[PDB]
Design an enzyme around this catalytic site. Structure first.
Site, PDB file in Angstrom:
ATOM      1  N   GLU A   1       3.640  80.070-137.554  1.00  0.00           N
ATOM      2  CA  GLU A   1       4.318  80.644-138.620  1.00  0.00           C
ATOM      3  C   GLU A   1       3.224  79.947-139.708  1.00  0.00           C
ATOM      4  O   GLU A   1       2.162  80.465-140.579  1.00  0.00           O
ATOM      5  CB  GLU A   1       4.684  81.291-139.852  1.00  0.00           C
ATOM      6  CG  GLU A   1       5.470  82.122-138.487  1.00  0.00           C
ATOM      7  CD  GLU A   1       6.837  82.736-139.616  1.00  0.00           C
ATOM      8  OE1 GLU A   1       7.840  82.593-139.702  1.00  0.00           O
ATOM      9  OE2 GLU A   1       6.653  82.659-141.024  1.00  0.00           O
TER      10      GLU A   1
ATOM     11  N   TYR B   1       1.412  47.616-134.215  1.00  0.00           N
ATOM     12  CA  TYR B   1       1.456  49.115-134.366  1.00  0.00           C
ATOM     13  C   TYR B   1       3.144  49.387-134.256  1.00  0.00           C
ATOM     14  O   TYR B   1       3.358  51.362-134.219  1.00  0.00           O
ATOM     15  CB  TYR B   1       1.428  49.055-133.010  1.00  0.00           C
ATOM     16  CG  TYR B   1      -0.572  49.236-132.300  1.00  0.00           C
ATOM     17  CD1 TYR B   1      -1.085  49.825-133.385  1.00  0.00           C
ATOM     18  CD2 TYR B   1      -0.736  48.502-131.581  1.00  0.00           C
ATOM     19  CE1 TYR B   1      -2.986  49.320-133.168  1.00  0.00           C
ATOM     20  CE2 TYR B   1      -2.907  49.037-131.008  1.00  0.00           C
ATOM     21  CZ  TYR B   1      -2.758  49.263-132.169  1.00  0.00           C
ATOM     22  OH  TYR B   1      -4.520  48.636-131.599  1.00  0.00           O
TER      23      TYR B   1
HETATM   24  N1  LIG Z   1      -0.997  54.054-134.019  1.00  0.00           N
HETATM   25  C1  LIG Z   1      -1.655  52.968-132.873  1.00  0.00           C
HETATM   26  N2  LIG Z   1      -2.787  53.866-132.768  1.00  0.00           N
HETATM   27  C2  LIG Z   1      -2.950  53.105-131.696  1.00  0.00           C
HETATM   28  C3  LIG Z   1      -1.669  52.326-130.752  1.00  0.00           C
HETATM   29  N3  LIG Z   1      -2.675  51.321-129.741  1.00  0.00           N
HETATM   30  C4  LIG Z   1      -3.871  51.642-129.511  1.00  0.00           C
HETATM   31  N4  LIG Z   1      -3.728  52.025-130.288  1.00  0.00           N
HETATM   32  C5  LIG Z   1      -5.413  52.740-131.257  1.00  0.00           C
HETATM   33  O1  LIG Z   1      -6.164  53.261-130.251  1.00  0.00           O
HETATM   34  C6  LIG Z   1      -7.253  52.871-130.172  1.00  0.00           C
HETATM   35  C7  LIG Z   1      -7.987  51.849-129.034  1.00  0.00           C
HETATM   36  O2  LIG Z   1      -7.272  53.025-127.516  1.00  0.00           O
HETATM   37  P1  LIG Z   1      -6.054  53.343-126.985  1.00  0.00           P
HETATM   38  O3  LIG Z   1      -5.232  53.888-126.866  1.00  0.00           O
HETATM   39  O4  LIG Z   1      -4.996  51.388-127.043  1.00  0.00           O
HETATM   40  O5  LIG Z   1      -6.802  52.938-125.627  1.00  0.00           O
HETATM   41  P2  LIG Z   1      -6.501  53.773-124.085  1.00  0.00           P
HETATM   42  O6  LIG Z   1      -6.333  55.507-124.042  1.00  0.00           O
HETATM   43  O7  LIG Z   1      -5.433  53.419-123.509  1.00  0.00           O
HETATM   44  O8  LIG Z   1      -8.285  53.618-123.027  1.00  0.00           O
HETATM   45  P3  LIG Z   1      -8.123  52.985-122.077  1.00  0.00           P
HETATM   46  O9  LIG Z   1      -7.229  51.125-122.574  1.00  0.00           O
HETATM   47  O10 LIG Z   1      -9.613  51.959-122.456  1.00  0.00           O
HETATM   48  O11 LIG Z   1      -7.698  53.045-121.144  1.00  0.00           O
HETATM   49  C8  LIG Z   1      -7.658  51.643-131.661  1.00  0.00           C
HETATM   50  O12 LIG Z   1      -8.433  52.711-132.089  1.00  0.00           O
HETATM   51  C9  LIG Z   1      -6.356  51.721-131.305  1.00  0.00           C
HETATM   52  O13 LIG Z   1      -5.587  51.392-132.873  1.00  0.00           O
HETATM   53  C10 LIG Z   1      -0.345  52.440-130.990  1.00  0.00           C
HETATM   54  O14 LIG Z   1       0.580  51.893-130.650  1.00  0.00           O
HETATM   55  N5  LIG Z   1      -0.435  52.456-132.248  1.00  0.00           N
END
Ligand SMILES: Nc1nc2c(ncn2[C@@H]2O[C@H](COP(=O)(O)OP(=O)(O)OP(=O)(O)O)[C@@H](O)[C@H]2O)c(=O)[nH]1
Ligand SMILES: CC[C@H](C)[C@H](NC(=O)[C@H]1CCCCN1C)C(=O)N(CCCCC(C)C)[C@H](C[C@@H](O)c1nc(C(=O)N[C@@H](Cc2ccc(F)cc2)C[C@H](C)C(=O)O)cs1)C(C)C
Ligand SMILES: Nc1nc2c(ncn2[C@@H]2O[C@H](COP(=O)(O)OP(=O)(O)O)[C@@H](O)[C@H]2O)c(=O)[nH]1
Ligand SMILES: [Ca+2]
Ligand SMILES: [Mg+2]
Lengths: 68, 440, 424
Positions: B254, B224
């Site tokens: 724009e 990540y």
């Molecule tokens: N690019 C990126 N993707 C992330 C990161 N952390 C999680 N993801 C992606 O986000 C998704 C998982 O959702 P999260 O954002 O971890 O979940 P949340 O919004 O915390 O929701 P809950 O944990 O269910 O409360 C997956 O598709 C992961 O690959 C990050 O730091 N960077």
């Protein structure tokens, strides 16, 4: 007539923006109400089913004491 | 004026949040304690950076940002990290129990316990603004908070802020880093619920960023941290228009005008160049023509799809660094002459361009080379529909069997919301097909 | 923090329960006095999940010790690790069990049940954010099976929105001569299919066959079986106990693993099998019948969902390549209509004695083989009423045996339904 139309345009803009806020607010109110009563219904049935186990468990213990 | 409030929802939004603000601080010469020596107006001002940073009387420059998660772990790292002094404690909002990769828990069950608190803190930021432009919402499609809570928040923001602009940076799920089988459900549910409430949404395909890290930065198995540093650069290029000034700077609004032909067709494809390692960038000067041409290679896109099998409805080019008009005009004229880019017949073959002279920045101990010049292309292409198609297919596969649906039904949702959401996505896929057909 | 509350019931439950606490205490660097003597901050980061923090910097297991025989709980206190548990969490009976489910569920168990709940209530109330409950038990006896499943039901009443997790040891004729165990197990599955969110199927038939055939122990002990149970239990709880992204709490695990609510019986696996490897070998051994703790061939059904935990210092790129490899080459055995249904975690910290290891958690339709085996034995005696007077004597009807039989056979049909389904 052009001054009355300019007025009508700015009122339409205001009215459509207000209708959008309104519908967003109504649609969100009915969703959250619908969800609350749905979720309470699912937990009620869960516990009313667990309470039927308590009625059955006492029928089993009383059926034992009717072998005396 | 024209302030922007950034909202970072869930793990993905929060961690992309950290990388963005860290990057903005380095770009603007702001220190981890919020002090900015180069800024002679103490207490306030309406310099370009003030769209993203407010100012205290004590000289501290504070991000116009709320961080929200239903779970304290990720934000606790912000609270005690290198940049803890930058944020007021009220800007970092956390619950106890997360949404468990369930849209329903983020939107309804757990989310409703914190939504009024979050609007309160957002309102405190809005009330500090002389002329609020709008909001930028950072969140995953896949997570329960990122999907479900963001949806709720967006609906509520439309009610409390009328038509203030709301932009999304949405993280689209990839198998290499996903943590949930139900991510397709959450993606369809949030996209449906948010569609009417968002003015412009930049999808970031994690698989695309993962490949760029592997292919272009020689990173073996990207984390990540790797993904987020690259995402930050793309987000920085898009927000650069708002945070800096200069004679040739075109504002993000724009580009939006050219990018959105109809309200639902508001998903631009971002492409970024150059993404190159320090080792490769040594004794190698990439010209304006070179980096412009790299915007039309699909390997550099933020979403995996093929624009060469689709049709453009807009093409916007956001240059930064050592870039002059003569070079840009020559490069775009080459793109025209060569063709390789078909527009829909109802759209002019224009290329809307901006330039900010401040060159790209990198975070210490990063993978990216510091280059003299960079570009982010924002295009509206029918090919972006491929991303919806892939996701809609996974949705169908599971939903025909009602796989996992009981987890959503158990938190109060009905099957009706699933099929309603999927019909809207079917309609969206048809819209991208319809706009690409030639006129009679 | 996300606290789990552990419960161990009956002889079997308390044996595997005790050995679980030995193994994970060693891993977190906790000695029998309850003091931290380790080298890594990662050992403590998620210590609240299983351990309460006490005054004098000490760490106490969040464990409730239960049985209708007082003897097993003396033997728990005896063998080092035993003076770590909370003294007032020991809830003992007098009469004993008698391998009678009715006794455990309706009569003798019901009398003791509220004394257990009071301890559960005290542990639960000072949790910052309770995940839910972890019960260890056997389904063949009387206490662990009958009183365990009563416990489960009574905890659902007061904590309906928490996760209910079991490690359920299945009876085999190869390990126990008791004839009445098909009844006890069938009655227990009737309860588990309704009242648990996720159940690990620890099968004594599988455990004995690994010990006899693979490990070459000509006369296997209960301790030989439980070395395999404790390896599994360490493995399948790794994601709950150390930091990581994948299945890091009980609800997230459930949401990834349980596509339909009744179908929550998992088939654990483990490599290397040992007594007291490269990533391609670990990956191959995991999806092979020999390494499964349920006596089921996975190549006789399809996997609905799968979790793969790799422990040790290895290449994450290599793990990703091999897990892709295994799905390509075994594609037919993964249901096409749940995409991306195999998830993979890697934890740097290996278990004791090994430098790398793999743990497998499969929701396989082939688990029906376990329930068919139990159902054939059940029906072998139920068609001629054998030993029913043990159960009727406590007040049960003959219809509750029919209902229990019928629900377990429905569960088999449902596994077969989703085994045969297609994308079309
Ligand atoms: N690019 C990126 N993707 C992330 C990161 N952390 C999680 N993801 C992606 O986000 C998704 C998982 O959702 P999260 O954002 O971890 O979940 P949340 O919004 O915390 O929701 P809950 O944990 O269910 O409360 C997956 O598709 C992961 O690959 C990050 O730091 N960077
Ligand atoms: C012929 C009797 C032998 C002893 C018995 N075999 C059978 O019953 C066969 C023959 C008929 C056909 C099928 N059955 C299963 C047997 O080997 N058993 C079952 C014991 C039944 C016990 C009676 C009271 C009903 C094995 C278990 C037996 O060998 C024991 N192991 C232990 C044991 O593991 N003790 C450990 C401690 C302990 C005590 C009690 C426990 F419940 C668990 C662990 C310490 C030892 C040193 C160790 O580390 O292995 C105690 S008794 C099974 C695994 C097959
Ligand atoms: N794997 C394993 N199985 C056990 C152990 N102790 C008992 N069993 C099995 O559990 C069943 C009897 O359960 P038990 O725990 O003795 O009954 P309780 O007195 O009601 O708790 C039989 O099928 C035994 O083979 C053990 O330590 N390990
Ligand atoms: Ca200033
Ligand atoms: Mg989260």
């Amino acid at each position: 007539e052009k001054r009355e139309h300019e007025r009508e345009v700015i009122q339409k803009a205001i009215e459509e923006n207000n209708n959008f806020i309104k519908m967003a607010k109504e649609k969100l109110a009915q969703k959250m109400e619908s969800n609350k009563e749905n979720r309470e219904a699912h937990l009620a049935a869960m516990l009313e089913r667990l309470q039927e186990k308590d009625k059955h468990a006492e029928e089993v213990r009383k059926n034992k004491e009717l072998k005396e | 004026m024209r302030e922007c409030i950034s909202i970072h929802v869930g793990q993905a939004g929060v961690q992309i949040g950290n990388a963005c603000w860290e990057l903005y601080c380095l770009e603007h010469g702001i220190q981890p304690d919020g002090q900015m020596p180069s800024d002679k107006t103490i207490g306030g001002g309406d310099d370009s950076f003030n769209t993203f940073f407010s100012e205290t009387g004590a000289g501290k420059h504070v991000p116009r940002a709320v961080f929200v998660d239903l779970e304290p772990t990720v934000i606790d790292e912000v609270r005690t990290g290198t940049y803890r002094q930058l944020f007021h404690p009220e800007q970092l909002i956390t619950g106890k129990e997360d949404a468990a990769n369930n849209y329903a828990r983020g939107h309804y069950t757990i989310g409703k316990e914190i939504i009024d608190l979050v609007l309160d803190r957002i309102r405190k930021l809005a009330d500090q603004c002389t002329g609020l432009q709008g909001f930028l919402v950072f969140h995953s499609f896949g997570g329960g908070t990122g999907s479900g809570f963001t949806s709720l928040l967006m609906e509520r923001l439309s009610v409390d802020y009328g038509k203030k602009s709301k932009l999304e940076f949405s993280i689209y799920p990839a198998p290499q880093v996903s943590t949930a089988v139900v991510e397709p459900y959450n993606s369809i549910l949030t996209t449906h619920t948010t569609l009417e409430h968002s003015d412009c949404a930049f999808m970031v395909d994690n698989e695309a960023i993962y490949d760029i890290c592997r292919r272009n930065l020689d990173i073996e198995r990207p984390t990540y941290t790797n993904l987020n540093r690259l995402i930050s650069q793309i987000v920085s290029s898009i927000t650069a228009s708002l945070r800096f000034d200069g004679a040739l700077n075109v504002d993000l609004t724009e580009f939006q005008t050219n990018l959105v032909p109809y309200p639902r067709i508001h998903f631009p494809l971002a492409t970024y160049a150059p993404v190159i390692s320090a080792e490769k960038a040594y004794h190698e000067q990439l010209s304006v023509a070179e980096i412009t041409n790299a915007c039309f290679e699909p390997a550099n896109q933020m979403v995996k799809c093929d624009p060469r099998h689709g049709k453009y409805m807009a093409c916007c080019l956001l240059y930064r660094g050592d870039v002059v008009p003569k070079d840009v005009n020559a490069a775009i004229a080459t793109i025209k002459t060569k063709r390789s880019i078909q527009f829909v017949d109802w759209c002019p073959t224009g290329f809307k361009v901006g330039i900010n002279y401040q060159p790209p920045t990198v975070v210490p101990g990063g993978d990216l080379a510091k280059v003299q010049r960079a570009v982010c292309m924002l295009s509206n292409t029918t090919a972006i529909a491929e991303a919806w198609a892939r996701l809609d297919h996974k949705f169908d596969l599971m939903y025909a069997k009602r796989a996992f649906v009981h987890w959503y039904v158990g938190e109060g949702m009905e099957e009706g919301e699933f099929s309603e959401a999927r019909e809207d996505m079917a309609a969206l896929e048809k819209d991208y097909e319809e706009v690409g057909v030639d006129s009679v | 923090m996300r606290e789990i509350v552990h419960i161990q019931a009956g002889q079997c439950g308390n044996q595997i329960g005790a050995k679980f606490w030995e193994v994970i205490s060693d891993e977190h660097g906790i000695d029998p006095t309850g003091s931290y003597h380790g080298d890594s901050d990662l050992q403590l980061e998620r210590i609240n999940v299983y351990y309460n923090e006490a005054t004098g910097n000490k760490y106490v297991p969040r464990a409730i010790l239960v049985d209708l025989e007082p003897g097993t709980m003396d033997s728990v206190r005896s063998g080092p690790f035993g003076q770590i548990f909370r003294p007032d969490n020991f809830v003992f009976g007098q009469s004993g069990a008698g391998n009678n489910w009715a006794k455990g569920h309706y009569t003798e168990g019901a009398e003791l049940v509220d004394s257990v709940l009071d301890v559960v209530r005290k542990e639960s109330e000072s949790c910052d954010c309770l995940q839910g409950f972890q019960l260890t038990h056997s389904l063949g006896g009387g206490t662990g099976s009958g009183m365990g499943t009563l416990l489960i039901s009574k905890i659902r009443e007061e904590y309906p929105d928490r996760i209910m997790n079991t490690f359920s040891v299945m009876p085999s004729p190869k390990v126990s001569d008791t004839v009445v165990e098909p009844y006890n197990a069938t009655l227990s599955v009737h309860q588990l299919v309704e009242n648990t969110d996720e159940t690990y199927c620890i099968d004594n038939e599988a455990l004995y066959d690994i010990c006899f055939r693979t490990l070459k122990l000509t006369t296997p002990t209960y301790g030989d079986l439980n070395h395999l149970v404790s390896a599994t239990m360490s493995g399948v709880t790794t994601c709950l106990r150390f930091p990581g992204q994948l299945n890091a709490d009980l609800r997230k695990l459930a949401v990834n693993m349980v596509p339909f609510p009744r179908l929550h019986f998992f088939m654990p696996g483990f490599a290397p099998l040992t007594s007291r490897l490269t990533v391609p070998e670990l990956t191959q051994q995991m999806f092979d019948s020999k390494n499964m703790m349920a006596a089921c061939d996975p190549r006789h059904g399809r996997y609905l969902t799968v979790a793969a935990i790799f422990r040790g210092r290895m290449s994450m790129k290599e793990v990703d390549e091999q897990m892709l490899n295994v799905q390509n080459k075994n594609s037919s055995y993964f249901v096409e209509w749940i995409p991306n249904n195999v998830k993979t975690a890697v934890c740097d910290i290996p278990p004791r004695g090994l430098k790398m290891s793999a743990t497998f958690i499969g929701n396989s339709t082939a688990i029906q083989e376990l329930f068919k085996r139990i159902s054939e034995q059940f029906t072998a005696m139920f068609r001629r009423k054998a030993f029913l007077h043990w159960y009727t004597g406590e007040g049960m009807d003959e219809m509750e045996f029919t209902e229990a039989e019928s629900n377990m056979n429905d569960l088999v049909s449902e596994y077969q339904q989703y085994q045969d389904a297609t994308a079309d």
